Write an enzyme that holds these catalytic residues in place. Sequence first.
Site, short mmCIF file in Angstrom:
data_model
loop_
_atom_site.label_atom_id
_atom_site.label_comp_id
_atom_site.label_asym_id
_atom_site.label_seq_id
_atom_site.Cartn_x
_atom_site.Cartn_y
_atom_site.Cartn_z
N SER A 12 0.79 -1.22 0.00
CA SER A 12 0.00 0.00 0.00
C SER A 12 0.83 1.28 0.00
O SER A 12 0.22 2.35 -0.11
CB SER A 12 -0.96 0.01 1.18
OG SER A 12 -1.98 -0.97 0.98
N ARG A 19 6.07 -1.23 12.72
CA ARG A 19 6.64 -0.42 11.65
C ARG A 19 6.89 1.01 12.14
O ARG A 19 8.00 1.54 12.01
CB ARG A 19 5.72 -0.45 10.42
CG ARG A 19 5.64 -1.84 9.76
CD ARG A 19 4.50 -1.93 8.75
NE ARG A 19 3.21 -1.62 9.35
CZ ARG A 19 2.09 -1.42 8.66
NH1 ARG A 19 2.07 -1.50 7.34
NH2 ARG A 19 0.97 -1.12 9.32
N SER A 56 -5.88 2.74 4.28
CA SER A 56 -5.34 1.86 3.24
C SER A 56 -6.44 1.06 2.56
O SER A 56 -6.41 -0.16 2.49
CB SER A 56 -4.27 0.91 3.81
OG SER A 56 -3.19 1.62 4.38
N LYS A 96 -0.01 3.60 -2.82
CA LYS A 96 -1.11 4.56 -2.85
C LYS A 96 -0.59 5.98 -3.07
O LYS A 96 -1.35 6.86 -3.50
CB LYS A 96 -1.96 4.46 -1.57
CG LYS A 96 -2.86 3.20 -1.56
CD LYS A 96 -3.80 3.10 -0.36
CE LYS A 96 -4.75 1.89 -0.51
NZ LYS A 96 -3.97 0.64 -0.51
#
Lengths: 237, 237
Positions: free
Chosen positions: A50, A222, A98, A53
Amino acid sequence: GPKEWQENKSWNAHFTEHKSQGVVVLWNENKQQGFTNNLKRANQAFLPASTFKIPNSLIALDLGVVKDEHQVFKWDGQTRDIATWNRDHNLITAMKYSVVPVYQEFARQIGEARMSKMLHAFDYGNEDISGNVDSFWLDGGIRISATEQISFLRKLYHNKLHVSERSQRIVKQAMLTEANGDYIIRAKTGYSPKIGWWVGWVELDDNVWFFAMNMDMPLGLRQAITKEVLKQEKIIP
Amino acid sequence: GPKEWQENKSWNAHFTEHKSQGVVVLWNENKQQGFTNNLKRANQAFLPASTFKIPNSLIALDLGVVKDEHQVFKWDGQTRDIATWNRDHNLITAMKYSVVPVYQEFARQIGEARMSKMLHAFDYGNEDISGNVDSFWLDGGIRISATEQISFLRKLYHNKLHVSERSQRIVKQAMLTEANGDYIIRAKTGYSPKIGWWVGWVELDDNVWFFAMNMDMPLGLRQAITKEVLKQEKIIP
Ligand SMILES: [Cl-]
């Protein structure tokens, strides 16, 4: 004399602390110098998931597939596993949550010929959209490394991508993730089965720090690992 | 039928908590309904003080006095009382730290004729720039009410002001004050010895709440009181 890229392996502790494996890459815009715990992995190209995007938004805006960041894209009524996906979205919220199916519709409307042309113009990763135009960033042939993400993000920051300035400003608005009196983070997460990403930058009063991180099989780690590196380097409190 | 404007005097408790006096005005964009603790004061006109940095920024950008949000306005070397003013700035940091001397230079470059014409085109308050071209929003003839601030900010949010869309997007970026996973605040503080202001809006996933508050003779109370109203109305956690 000094190098464009330096390795700081003390950041490995932030991966080790979570039994994780990955790379963090930082770029100091004022100093024009980059830092990473693993220069090899920093240049290893992975599915963007993602994080795609960001370029997908830019292309959809520049072609008028998305008219502005307020246009509503109605839920198609299919109940999907992620609850925040089962509702109407605009560009802002589709990026925040997302929302893959919203961006899959963007991609189909862009179409393969314009998507490939635009990714070449962006110098984006390996520029390979093989597979389905509405899923290649999730299960197709496109690959981008962390340093390639930095290069792409720096162009976006400076409005140097080959799309309009307006498209770039709207996407940077949509990337807004966190802000206070100390810093602004503009960023995008990505998750695929084997790889998780966080890419973006930290705006300070008098500098910008670009970052790109990925790690094996991730989700909150993350941002947490990235923020531990940012804190260690005194970029954020 | 329902009321466009409703009075909620229970918000007065957030003012008297601090031995303070003022008005908070809220506008629910989805509902097209406004709320305030003081309907009369909501419509009374006051000096805008540094909330005028919003229209001043828009005009300076649209006229090319400021090329973009990165252009540096070097410190003139005069040590002033507010330490953050004694350094170089760009549009982002000049708005963040309310750097009056940077904006006075903008106003001098704009000049009386173009400043007056622009404020007329904005429908901004009483449209009166009587006083010094570089201080009338602090000690001259310009006056604007809290509800007029809302109407101006709604136009800005929707890119409906006369100036270019680009100028409006840059100023909305510069107004970024706070952001997290729950909300985004774009706003501008204003202080004079007589009047304190906080005006702006709160962006949520599926709504935006505009706000304008002023209070007699102030500093952190401006945001603190406004947030207590936002919290009472369940707008922010
Ligand atoms: Cl923004």
